[PDB]
Design a protein around this nucleic acid. Structure first.
Ligand SMILES: Nc1nc2c(ncn2[C@@H]2O[C@H](COP(=O)(O)OP(=O)(O)OP(=O)(O)O)[C@@H](O)[C@H]2O)c(=O)[nH]1
Lengths: 267, 79, 73, 843, 70
RNA sequence: AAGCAGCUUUACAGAUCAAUGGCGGAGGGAGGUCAACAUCAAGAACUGUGGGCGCCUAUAGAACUUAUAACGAACAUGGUUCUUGCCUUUUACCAGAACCAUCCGGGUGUUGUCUCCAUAGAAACAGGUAAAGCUGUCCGUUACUGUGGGCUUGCCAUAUUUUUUGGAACUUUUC
């Protein structure tokens, strides 16, 4: 019931399984739930921040992609003496409404705007709080027919609370039915260099964030779409015939056989 | 019931009807009822004699209606 | 009940009225008042005939019902 | 023809109820209706329409599996790459749709779905003009914030039926985690809070003007519907509708016994909570937390519902939807309350009057109908029209008019064209129509040549009726342009295309106001940052492909006085002395609200068309407005009031009553321009002090003469009057969680608008609504300083309502106090800066 | 039941009613009922000899209702 | 939502024990870090080929759209060309742009199988495609009853003005 079978693909679960799992995983994952948090840290503000060559304080600083800043013309239009100077016009603006501040934008992807500002409340301190609990920090603000589900006496269930806590989770948890991934296919720490450093960090780890956002952008910007219908997995093919046969072993041992193996072949 | 809904659906189209009186009325139908009251405009009455008339606004009582005859497009209408 | 009345649905019928006229055509709808809806109707006053179309008869006016033909394809 | 229609067949993904039955019900006047839908940002409008669309079609293709279940919500009525990449509806889109009621008898309906974003209010304006009633839709969290007040105020001010839908209840229970009794006083609390803003009526859950929903979960409550679907099968059909009235508003049944007494016996929650909120909570919290079969047995037992093991197997959310969308059926409860909440006879003359001079003359016998909007669908451009009188077919030659040329009021008065084609709006698809009937809204083809913006359409055989018929106002766009950006094409040889580019925009976008200066540099006026952005994108992509050039964000100042006089003709046969006066902030505030004068409200200055004894009755009565001046009030402006004030007037009265056109035409000429920036003049009363007139006037008195004279008289009028410089201010709405308040304070300071005008807590949420003021010219990039600074928390809207114009902090003419370029200007000296600057683009 | 008919538009206006037995009456429409009983003032019979009466016409009888002046 | 009746089934005793009619079956389930051979974003519309009776289905090519909303909520390297670099150049990089590769995977179908399991059987015969009960025959219960299950049902019960507890009855003249 819990999985496909021996081929081990395509798992599945039930709730408290998750809720436990999540509760345990959470120290590893501190990630802001709402998309609305990320604004100029999203993907498209990084693209536009590239195509237009803009520097975000927490964004990575890239190459021009258009080599030339050089055309500069004064003119009846441009003259300082006809233009009214108020406000700095920060870069971030030019990443915000890029058809507005940064003129002649090219290959510029139109950003998202305005999500609802998630107000979700959660108890990360007391777990003896019942299901529906007015939060301290909220503003003050014939006999035989009956209600339907009130037939059952009480709505709050031992699970339902963490059913709620799981109603919001990043991709893995909120889904209780999914399939299998290579171990390295999982990326644990990708989350952490998507976040604000806040302050207390040294410029070491901050600059590190800028590094990994840079690389991240690059890893995003180039999809592929190949297909290998030609190549049967090299093992599957080569293990055909004779000179190879299949067995089991302890891992470390196979390691050793390899150690002398290629050690030889070097010699 | 469906026999009433059909009526409500022909509101606005032009309708023919017959009463226990013996006369038939023809005109655009404006208001109906669950009783089967009617309210028509530009009516062209025709009794047993053949006597034609014009009535600007007209009411009926359902009890008095024998049978109504309604527009052709109202056969594709939903049941 | 009314199980028999649903069985008549979409058959050509011959309906005699208290007025004497006899209407003929398929049956589209039936009611709790016995209001009948008929498609492509013809009254037969009597060697006589007239074309109406869609007709909705009242319950008071109807006397009896009688099948002309089977349900049409 | 009909065959090309057949290759249209496989395009429009048909529908349950087919067409010709719907489009058959069309010609009937009393059926159909128009429904516009509005709420503030992210109310769920566009999504709600998504619900209705799926309650319509079976086949809608473009649903991915990924959307079918779940996680990413469908946008249909968001047809544009622009809308889809942004995530907010821009150009309102409807779906002409047939729906049914609880009583099963189906009305044809015109669905219109507007943007909620304040900058785009323009289309909501347009939406009103079409809509017979609106659904105002609320995020349950923020209740009704100020923008909503402005909304309802506007719609009632347009005499149009309403209903309310409070929405995203899901967000309430799940995010906010409300104990039921919190929630009931929530709903209630809001409903009172709005009824306060409801003049001359009140809404109420049983009034069926209030409808509950969540879109993302796709469910809807009208207690009529709700109960009927369920409790109806319980109790004898007599008591039921009574029991509806027995539901909301503090009523208790202890055992089968309805008693308003406190709650006695033991348990206490009111009847509403009893049959609605709690059992709902049980639906959610169980369907999340409950063993499936446990739910199943309840689905038969209570609800007569059946799960399929497919539906059994789902991640919590997509399941949970299918749960609800299954338990509730193809929401007609919405429609049903709409169904009964609109009165054709009562209000039809109200609204149809509000947009013209009422009459009425020429009933029927005519084709006359109201043209709102020139729209761009997948193919090219159609026109959006509501049909008041007549029928229409392809090719029918018809006569054209625009709303300004209906401000004018035989031959030559009409440019005319045929209907090239007629569509119905099917959202992403368009449904061809040959024949068009009274009352239904449709698209036309080929008429775009005729005009810009709002256009009245008519075809009439009777010069009787032609004289008798009336004409629609230029539509009030509920917020004024106020935002200014200079455009130049980057390659001035490219100049021509840009023009027609601009042209189409002035059509496709209602509120934008475009100019071409003397200098040649083109000018754009739009609501705010976002708005004119959407323009510029559609401009550098859709229409013109030309790479263009853009200025710094700008405002549009104005010219006023804070309190002698001569005037001279270059042939001094005229003797003119006109001083100027500041004017009443009371009359200012009442001019800001343009009304029909209903109630003690000071009548709009349009009511000088109502008796100058009536007008001067409002004046003398309310303002202490000088009775002599009230009889000396001559004209109003695009702006303030002009008065003939002196005895020499009466000395030469007929001489004046001859030339009054020369006076006022010269005067509109004046206040349109201005002495300082050639920008509008505001808050200025001209008492007309002295005139002499050329000797025995042998074609001596001419508009050519007196007009630019009195023009000067106005100019110097302001100049000696201690003129100041008017500025606008975006009225600021800010939405935050509480602890972040200090942050906002900071920013306000720096922006120098820095006005925290009100501070507000939001019922039962951790929310502060703050209201404030910041100057448009200081409003650049504000919203992103917010959104960054609060880490996405909070939210920002800069709206122009009440049109309040502050003073420019500087003295208009002081040459020295400036400090050089490439700096923000010193707060003590400004108006000199601003004015000299504009002038350098002027004189 | 008791669908209050559309006689709001006839209140305080002249009428030309028709009733059972081919008899008809003129009058100012004062009030109406659930079963369509009517209140007429200044009631005049139409035999062609017109007799002044001054009247409550019964509902069942009513065949129809006209308006003299637009 | 109980019971009654109707409908569907059902373990069935049955009429027939014929011709029938219905539903299923004429090659099972699932799972196999099992392989072989194919295929692989989606959609409307144009052209060509093939099959079946102008229409439908399959395959190939071209154009447009989707946010490239995603074969993988994964990303690694290499090559050619243009800007960059510098002197070095190689190893090679740097840092971008384009266009080409490779590699690590994934999914679907078909075929052949392997493991654990399933109980009638009619899983019997003959026709062909790229596919199959696809077709024809065929057989299992059976097409009309009573016991037992479920509902899709009666819509749930009104003699006093708008339908079903009657204003009906009766007579006579005209063509
Ligand atoms: N929590 C919650 N959010 C919803 C629900 N329905 C819609 N939303 C949010 O509404 C936002 C989009 O609103 P739309 O309906 O698509 O468009 P809109 O509400 O009219 O906003 P505009 O179109 O720009 O006026 C998305 O962020 C959804 O998350 C709901 O039922 N529950």
């Amino acid at each position: 019931k819990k999985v496909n079978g021996t081929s081990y693909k395509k798992w599945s679960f039930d709730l408290p399984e998750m809720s436990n799992l999540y509760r345990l995983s959470t120290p590893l994952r501190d990630e802001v739930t709402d998309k609305n948090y990320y604004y100029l840290f999203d993907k498209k503000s990084f693209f536009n921040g590239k195509a237009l060559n803009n520097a975000i304080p927490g964004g990575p600083k890239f190459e021009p992609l258009y080599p030339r800043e050089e055309e500069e013309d004064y003119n009846e239009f441009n003259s300082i003496d006809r233009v009214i100077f108020r406000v700095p016009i920060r870069s971030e603006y030019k990443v915000a409404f890029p058809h507005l501040y940064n003129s002649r934008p090219r290959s510029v992807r139109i950003p998202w705007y305005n999500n609802p500002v998630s107000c979700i409340i959660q108890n990360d301190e007391e777990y003896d709080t019942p299901a529906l609990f007015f939060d301290p920090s909220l503003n003050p603000i014939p006999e035989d027919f009956a209600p339907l589900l009130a037939e059952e006496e009480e709505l709050i269930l031992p699970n339902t609370k963490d059913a709620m806590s799981l109603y919001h989770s990043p991709f893995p948890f909120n889904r209780t039915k999914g399939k299998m991934v290579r171990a390295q296919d999982v990326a644990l720490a990708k989350k952490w260099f998507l976040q604000h450093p806040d302050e207390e960090y040294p410029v070491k780890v901050k600059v590190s964030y800028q590094k990994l956002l840079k690389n991240y952008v690059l890893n995003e910007l180039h999809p592929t779409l190949p297909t290998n219908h030609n190549k049967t997995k090299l093992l599957k093919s080569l293990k055909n015939t004779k000179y190879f046969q299949q067995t089991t072993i302890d891992w470390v041992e196979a390691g050793l056989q390899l150690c002398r193996q290629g050690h030889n072949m070097l010699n | 019931g469906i026999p009433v809904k059909l009526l409500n659906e022909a509101q606005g189209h032009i309708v023919s009807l017959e009463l226990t009186t013996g006369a038939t009325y023809r005109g655009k139908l404006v208001e109906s009822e669950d009783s089967m009251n009617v309210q028509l405009r530009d009516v062209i009455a025709t009794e047993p004699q053949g006597a034609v008339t014009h009535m600007d606004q007209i009411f009926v009582r359902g009890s008095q209606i024998k049978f109504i005859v309604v527009p052709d497009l109202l056969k594709n209408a939903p049941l | 009940h009314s199980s028999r009345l649903a069985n008549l649905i979409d058959y050509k019928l011959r309906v005699l009225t208290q007025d004497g006229r006899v209407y003929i055509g398929q049956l589209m709808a039936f009611d709790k008042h016995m209001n009948l809806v008929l498609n492509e109707c013809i009254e037969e006053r009597v060697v006589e005939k007239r074309v109406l179309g869609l007709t909705i008869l009242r319950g008071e006016q109807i006397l009896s019902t009688v099948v002309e033909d089977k349900p049409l394809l | 023809e009909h065959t090309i229609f057949t290759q249209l067949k496989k395009n429009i993904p048909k529908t349950r109820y087919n067409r010709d039955y719907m489009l058959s019900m069309a010609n009937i006047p009393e059926r159909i209706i128009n429904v516009g839908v509005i709420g503030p940002l992210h109310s769920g409008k566009t999504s709600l329409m998504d619900l209705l669309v799926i309650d319509s079609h079976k086949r809608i293709p473009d649903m991915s599996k990924n959307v079918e279940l779940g996680w990413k919500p469908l946008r249909y009525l968001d047809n544009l790459k622009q809308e889809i990449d942004r995530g907010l509806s821009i150009k309102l889109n409807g779906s002409t749709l047939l729906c049914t009621d609880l009583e099963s008898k189906s009305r044809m309906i015109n669905f219109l779905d507007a943007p909620g974003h304040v900058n785009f209010m323009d289309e909501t304006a347009v939406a009103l003009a079409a809509s017979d009633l609106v659904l105002i839709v609320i995020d349950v969290v923020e209740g009704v914030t100020f923008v909503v007040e402005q909304l309802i105020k506007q719609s009632i001010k347009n005499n149009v039926a309403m209903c309310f839908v409070i929405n995203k209840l899901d967000r309430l229970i799940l995010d906010l985690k409300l104990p039921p009794m919190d929630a009931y006083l929530k709903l209630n609390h809001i409903i009172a809070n709005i009824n306060s803003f409801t003049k001359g009526n009140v809404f109420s859950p049983i009034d069926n003007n209030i409808i509950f929903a969540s879109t993302k979960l796709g469910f809807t409550f009208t207690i009529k519907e709700f109960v009927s679907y369920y409790y109806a099968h319980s109790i004898p059909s007599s008591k039921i509708d009574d029991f509806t009235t027995r539901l909301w508003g503090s009523v208790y049944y202890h055992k089968g016994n309805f008693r308003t007494k406190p709650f006695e016996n033991v348990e206490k929650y009111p009847t509403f909570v009893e049959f609605i909120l709690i059992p709902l909570y049980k639906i959610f919290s169980y369907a999340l937390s409950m063993e499936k079969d446990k739910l199943k047995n309840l689905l038969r037992s209570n609800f007569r519902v059946n799960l399929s093991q497919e539906a059994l197997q789902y991640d919590p959310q997509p399941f949970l939807k299918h749960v609800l969308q299954l338990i509730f059926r193809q929401q007609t409860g919405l429609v049903d309350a709409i169904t009964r909440c609109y009165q054709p006879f009562e209000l039809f003359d109200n609204k149809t009057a509000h947009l013209s001079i009422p009459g009425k003359s020429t009933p029927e016998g005519t084709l006359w109908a109201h043209v709102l909007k020139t729209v761009d669908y997948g193919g090219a451009e159609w026109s959006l029209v509501r049909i008041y009188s007549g029928l229409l077919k392809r090719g029918d030659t018809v006569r054209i008019l625009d709303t300004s040329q209906s401000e004018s009021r035989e031959d030559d008065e009409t440019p005319s064209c045929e209907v090239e084609e007629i569509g119905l709006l099917g959202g992403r698809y368009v449904y061809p129509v040959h024949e068009a009937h009274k009352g239904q809204i449709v698209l036309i083809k080929g008429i775009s040549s005729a005009y810009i913006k709002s256009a009245t359409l008519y075809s009439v055989k009777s010069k009787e009726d032609m004289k008798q018929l009336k004409f629609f106002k230029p539509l009030d766009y509920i917020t004024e342009a106020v935002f200014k950006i200079v455009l130049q094409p980057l390659l001035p040889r490219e100049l021509p295309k840009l023009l027609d580019a601009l042209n189409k925009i002035s059509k496709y976008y209602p509120g934008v106001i475009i100019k071409v200066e003397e200098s040649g540099e083109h000018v754009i006026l739009g609501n705010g940052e976002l708005y004119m952005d959407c323009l510029l994108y559609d401009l550098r992509a859709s229409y013109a492909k030309i790479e263009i050039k853009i200025s710094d964000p700008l405002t549009v100042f104005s010219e006023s006085c804070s309190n002698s006089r001569l005037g001279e003709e270059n042939l001094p046969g005229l003797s003119i002395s006109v001083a100027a006066e500041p004017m009443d902030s009371k009359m200012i505030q009442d001019l800001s609200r343009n009304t029909l004068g209903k109630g003690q409200n000071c009548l709009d200055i349009d009511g000088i068309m109502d008796n100058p004894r009536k007008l001067s009755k409002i004046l003398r009565t309310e303002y202490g407005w000088d009775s002599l001046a009230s009889r000396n009030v001559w004209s109003f402006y695009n702006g303030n009031v002009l008065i003939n004030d002196t005895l020499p007037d009466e000395i030469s009265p007929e001489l004046l009553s001859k030339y009054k056109e020369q006076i006022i035409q010269g005067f509109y000429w004046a206040v349109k321009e201005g002495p300082l920036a050639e920008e509008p003049i505001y808050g200025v009363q001209y008492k007309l002090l002295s005139i002499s007139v050329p000797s025995d006037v042998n074609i001596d008195v001419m508009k050519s003469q007196i007009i630019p004279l009195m023009k000067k008289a106005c100019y110097v009028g302001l100049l000696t009057a201690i003129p100041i410089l008017l500025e606008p201010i975006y009225e600021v709405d800010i939405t935050v969680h509480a602890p972040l308040l200090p942050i906002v304070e900071e920013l306000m300071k720096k922006r120098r608008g820095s006005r925290i005008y009100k501070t507000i807590k939001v019922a039962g949420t951790p929310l502060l609504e703050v209201r404030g003021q910041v100057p448009v010219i200081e409003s650049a990039g504000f919203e992103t300083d917010l959104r960054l600074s609060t880490n996405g928390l909070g939210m920002c809207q800069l709206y122009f309502w009440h049109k309040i114009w502050r003073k420019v902090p500087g003295d208009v003419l002081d040459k020295d106090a400036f400090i050089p370029k490439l700096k923000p200007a010193p707060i003590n000296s400004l108006s000199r800066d601003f004015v000299m600057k504009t002038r350098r683009r002027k004189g | 039941m008791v669908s209050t008919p559309e006689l709001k538009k006839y209140m305080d206006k002249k009428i030309l009613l028709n009733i059972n037995g081919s008899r008809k009456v003129a009058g100012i429409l004062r009030g109406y009922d659930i079963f369509l009983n009517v209140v007429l003032d200044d009631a005049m019979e139409i035999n062609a000899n017109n007799h002044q009466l001054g009247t409550v016409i019964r509902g069942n009888s009513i065949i129809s209702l006209e308006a003299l002046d637009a």
